[PDB]
Amino acid sequence: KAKELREKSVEELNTELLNLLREQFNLRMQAASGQLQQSHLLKQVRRDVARVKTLLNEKAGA
């Protein structure tokens, strides 16, 4: 996914980041409620957030 995400800019990657944070919250609410079933989506979204933050820190200037 990093190859696709490198095309995006600092804005439109922050938007992506915030959207994955919203999705992570919603998955957390379903999971904690005990009505998620697909328990593996939490690993998927967390690693996606880590990827977006890595690309942000790369494009910051360092």
Added chain:
RNA sequence: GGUUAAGCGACUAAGCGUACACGGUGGAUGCCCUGGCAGUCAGAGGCGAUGAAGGACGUGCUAAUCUGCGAUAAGCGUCGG
């Protein structure tokens, strides 16, 4: 054969002893090595304010401990195998 008298007198085991058979307990002996000990031949001889040694807390689909890791948290990018 009957009665009496005299003499002698086996068989008892509440428990115990010894022998043998079979058991219980217990964890020696034998065999074993993912642990150690002593060295040889090579390395390396340091880490730390770019925050160490060592820790607390946390981190999973996780209830706990160990291992790894640090709010990007059993992990993120890139390059090779």
